[PDB]
Each structure stands twice: as structure tokens, then as C-alpha cells.
Design a protein around this motif. Structure first.
Motif, mmCIF file in Angstrom:
data_model
loop_
_atom_site.group_PDB
_atom_site.id
_atom_site.type_symbol
_atom_site.label_atom_id
_atom_site.label_comp_id
_atom_site.label_asym_id
_atom_site.label_seq_id
_atom_site.Cartn_x
_atom_site.Cartn_y
_atom_site.Cartn_z
ATOM 1 N N UNK A 126 0.807 -1.207 0.000
ATOM 2 C CA UNK A 126 0.000 0.000 0.000
ATOM 3 C C UNK A 126 0.847 1.267 0.000
ATOM 4 N N UNK A 127 1.899 1.261 0.807
ATOM 5 C CA UNK A 127 2.782 2.412 0.915
ATOM 6 C C UNK A 127 3.481 2.680 -0.410
ATOM 7 N N UNK A 128 3.960 1.633 -1.069
ATOM 8 C CA UNK A 128 4.654 1.786 -2.342
ATOM 9 C C UNK A 128 3.651 2.185 -3.420
ATOM 10 N N UNK A 129 2.448 1.636 -3.364
ATOM 11 C CA UNK A 129 1.455 2.028 -4.339
ATOM 12 C C UNK A 129 1.088 3.490 -4.303
ATOM 13 N N UNK A 130 0.878 4.018 -3.104
ATOM 14 C CA UNK A 130 0.628 5.426 -2.890
ATOM 15 C C UNK A 130 1.773 6.277 -3.429
ATOM 16 N N UNK A 131 2.995 5.951 -3.040
ATOM 17 C CA UNK A 131 4.158 6.707 -3.477
ATOM 18 C C UNK A 131 4.307 6.761 -4.994
ATOM 19 N N UNK A 132 4.091 5.633 -5.661
ATOM 20 C CA UNK A 132 4.213 5.583 -7.119
ATOM 21 C C UNK A 132 3.127 6.379 -7.826
ATOM 22 N N UNK A 133 1.856 6.255 -7.443
ATOM 23 C CA UNK A 133 0.802 7.018 -8.125
ATOM 24 C C UNK A 133 0.943 8.518 -7.896
ATOM 25 N N UNK A 134 1.338 8.915 -6.690
ATOM 26 C CA UNK A 134 1.564 10.322 -6.357
ATOM 27 C C UNK A 134 2.732 10.878 -7.159
ATOM 28 N N UNK A 135 3.829 10.153 -7.249
ATOM 29 C CA UNK A 135 4.971 10.555 -8.089
ATOM 30 C C UNK A 135 4.522 10.767 -9.537
ATOM 31 N N UNK A 181 -6.974 11.243 -16.606
ATOM 32 C CA UNK A 181 -7.577 10.003 -17.105
ATOM 33 C C UNK A 181 -8.318 9.229 -16.045
ATOM 34 N N UNK A 182 -8.215 9.684 -14.795
ATOM 35 C CA UNK A 182 -8.859 9.027 -13.680
ATOM 36 C C UNK A 182 -10.050 9.862 -13.197
ATOM 37 N N UNK A 183 -11.227 9.552 -13.718
ATOM 38 C CA UNK A 183 -12.412 10.299 -13.283
ATOM 39 C C UNK A 183 -12.613 10.201 -11.781
ATOM 40 N N UNK A 184 -12.181 9.118 -11.171
ATOM 41 C CA UNK A 184 -12.206 8.861 -9.740
ATOM 42 C C UNK A 184 -11.303 9.791 -8.913
ATOM 43 N N UNK A 185 -10.231 10.322 -9.478
ATOM 44 C CA UNK A 185 -9.222 11.051 -8.749
ATOM 45 C C UNK A 185 -8.956 12.474 -9.244
ATOM 46 N N UNK A 233 -1.129 16.604 -0.397
ATOM 47 C CA UNK A 233 -1.773 16.271 0.866
ATOM 48 C C UNK A 233 -3.101 15.559 0.630
ATOM 49 N N UNK A 234 -3.864 16.047 -0.363
ATOM 50 C CA UNK A 234 -5.157 15.394 -0.581
ATOM 51 C C UNK A 234 -5.044 13.991 -1.132
ATOM 52 N N UNK A 235 -4.038 13.812 -1.997
ATOM 53 C CA UNK A 235 -3.745 12.485 -2.532
ATOM 54 C C UNK A 235 -3.316 11.529 -1.437
ATOM 55 N N UNK A 236 -2.433 12.037 -0.555
ATOM 56 C CA UNK A 236 -1.994 11.144 0.529
ATOM 57 C C UNK A 236 -3.150 10.726 1.425
ATOM 58 N N UNK A 237 -4.189 11.544 1.566
ATOM 59 C CA UNK A 237 -5.270 11.221 2.496
ATOM 60 C C UNK A 237 -6.397 10.410 1.882
ATOM 61 N N UNK A 238 -6.344 10.202 0.573
ATOM 62 C CA UNK A 238 -7.381 9.457 -0.112
ATOM 63 C C UNK A 238 -7.167 7.954 0.033
ATOM 64 N N UNK A 239 -8.069 7.309 0.762
ATOM 65 C CA UNK A 239 -8.142 5.868 0.932
ATOM 66 C C UNK A 239 -8.417 5.154 -0.390
ATOM 67 N N UNK A 240 -9.185 5.808 -1.255
ATOM 68 C CA UNK A 240 -9.439 5.278 -2.582
ATOM 69 C C UNK A 240 -8.189 5.200 -3.452
ATOM 70 N N UNK A 241 -7.366 6.240 -3.367
ATOM 71 C CA UNK A 241 -6.134 6.245 -4.151
ATOM 72 C C UNK A 241 -5.213 5.142 -3.638
ATOM 73 N N UNK A 242 -5.194 4.993 -2.298
ATOM 74 C CA UNK A 242 -4.341 3.947 -1.738
ATOM 75 C C UNK A 242 -4.821 2.560 -2.169
ATOM 76 N N UNK A 294 -6.399 1.853 -4.890
ATOM 77 C CA UNK A 294 -6.076 1.598 -6.302
ATOM 78 C C UNK A 294 -4.587 1.318 -6.485
ATOM 79 N N UNK A 295 -3.703 1.949 -5.726
ATOM 80 C CA UNK A 295 -2.291 1.640 -5.690
ATOM 81 C C UNK A 295 -2.018 0.179 -5.386
ATOM 82 N N UNK A 296 -2.741 -0.420 -4.451
ATOM 83 C CA UNK A 296 -2.570 -1.829 -4.119
ATOM 84 C C UNK A 296 -2.941 -2.695 -5.323
ATOM 85 N N UNK A 297 -4.074 -2.390 -5.940
ATOM 86 C CA UNK A 297 -4.581 -3.037 -7.154
ATOM 87 C C UNK A 297 -3.556 -3.014 -8.289
ATOM 88 N N UNK A 298 -2.973 -1.855 -8.572
ATOM 89 C CA UNK A 298 -1.940 -1.680 -9.590
ATOM 90 C C UNK A 298 -0.725 -2.537 -9.284
#
Ligand code: HEM
Length: 154
Positions: free
Chosen positions: A23-32, A43-47, A54-63, A65-69
Motif C-alpha cells: 500500500x505504501x509503495x502504491x501510494x508513493x508511485x501514483x503520487x509521483x 484520465x482518472x475520473x475517480x481522482x 496532501x489530498x492524494x496522501x489522504x485518499x483511501x481510494x487512491x491507496x 487503487x495503488x494496491x490493485x496496480x
């Protein structure tokens, strides 16, 4: 292209480390990716609405999706080149449903290398980075070929 067994071993050794915190690596990669190439966020209607890191880091949904990726990417890498069945559904959804141009796969490749280099410097020296790059290039080449077959191009 074909990686050797030694190259696969360098890839899967650092990946074993990544898997200690998916989860931590997924968050870091999508945010980067979204900070470095803001157009990808569109391209992400969800995000799309997220304005700041800060908002990206706090989104449980983004995290989530990072795990999924990273779970899907991890499954492909563990096949050590024999990934044609795993790749087929991913190529189809990204080409036809999500409409992602193939250049954006280069951008996420860059993001993955950046984060591994930052988090794992002792297991991501020059030879290991070169092997990870070859693996990602193999993936991009095969996804590009499937894009073509599916009628998109990328
Ligand atoms: C390492 C490359 C990537 C992997 C392994 C990956 C994997 C996935 C997976 C497994 C899904 C969910 C199932 C599906 O829709 O196929 C997904 C959804 C999606 N991907 Fe990717 N993806 C990658 C790169 C990208 C890139 C570069 C972008 C866009 C810049 C992208 C855009 C999307 C979008 C928009 C969705 C749907 C999100 C939602 O609304 O739930 N993907 N991806």
C-alpha cells in the motif's frame, strides 16, 4: 527481448522488499506519477478532483487503487516473461475502456524506478535498476503490440 535469470533475480529481489508494504509503495508511485505528469491524473475520473499532494496522501481510494496496480504488476513480474495471459485483459481495458495512450506507460515506469531508488538504495544499485528497466521495457513492448492488435495503437 529476453531477460536472463540473473536479471530476473535482481528484479524479484527488490520486489520482495516492495511487497513488505504494497500500500505504501502504491501510494508513493501514483503520487509521483501525478505530480511529475499531471496530465495522467485527468484520465482518472475517480481522482481528477484531487488538487494537492496532501489530498492524494489522504485518499483511501487512491491507496486502494495503488494496491490493485502493484498486485497486478507483481503477478506479471513473477511470471518472468511468460505473461501473455495476464497481459491480455489489462491491454484490453487500458486500450478500450480507459483509453490510456502508450506513452503514459513510460511515465509510470519512470515513477516506479524513482520510488524504488528512493526506498531501496542498497538493493537498487545500477545493475538492479538496469534489470528493472529491461523488465518494464519488455512489459511496455508487449502491451504496445497488443494495443495494435486490439485496434488502438497507444
Ligand atoms: C504498470 C501499469 C499499470 C498497471 C499494472 C495497471 C493496472 C490496472 C488495473 C489492474 C486496473 C483495474 C482493472 C482494469 O480496469 O483493468 C486498472 C484500472 C485503471 N487504470 Fe491502470 N494500470 C497501469 C497503468 C495505468 C496508467 C499509466 C494509467 C493512466 C495514466 C492507468 C489508468 C487506469 C484507469 C483510469 C483505471 C480505472 C480506475 C477506476 O476508475 O477504477 N493505468 N489499472
Amino acid at each position: 527481448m529476453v531477460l536472463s535469470e540473473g536479471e530476473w533475480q535482481l528484479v524479484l529481489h527488490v520486489w520482495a522488499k516492495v511487497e513488505a508494504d504494497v500500500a505504501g509503495h502504491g501510494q508513493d508511485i501514483l503520487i509521483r506519477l501525478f505530480k511529475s505528469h499531471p496530465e495522467t491524473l485527468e484520465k482518472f475520473d475517480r481522482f481528477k478532483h484531487l488538487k494537492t499532494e496532501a489530498e492524494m496522501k489522504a485518499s483511501e481510494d487512491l491507496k486502494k487503487h495503488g494496491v490493485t496496480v502493484l498486485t497486478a504488476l507483481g503477478a506479471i513480474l513473477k511470471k518472468k516473461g511468460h505473461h501473455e495471459a495476464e497481459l491480455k485483459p489489462l491491454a484490453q481495458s487500458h486500450a478500450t475502456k480507459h483509453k490510456i495512450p502508450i506513452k503514459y506507460a513510460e511515465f509510470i515506469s519512470e515513477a516506479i524506478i524513482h520510488v524504488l531508488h528512493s526506498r531501496h538504495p542498497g538493493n537498487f544499485g545500477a545493475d538492479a535498476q538496469g534489470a528493472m528497466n529491461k523488465a518494464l521495457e519488455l512489459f511496455r513492448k508487449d502491451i504496445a503490440a497488443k494495443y495494435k492488435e486490439l485496434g488502438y495503437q497507444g
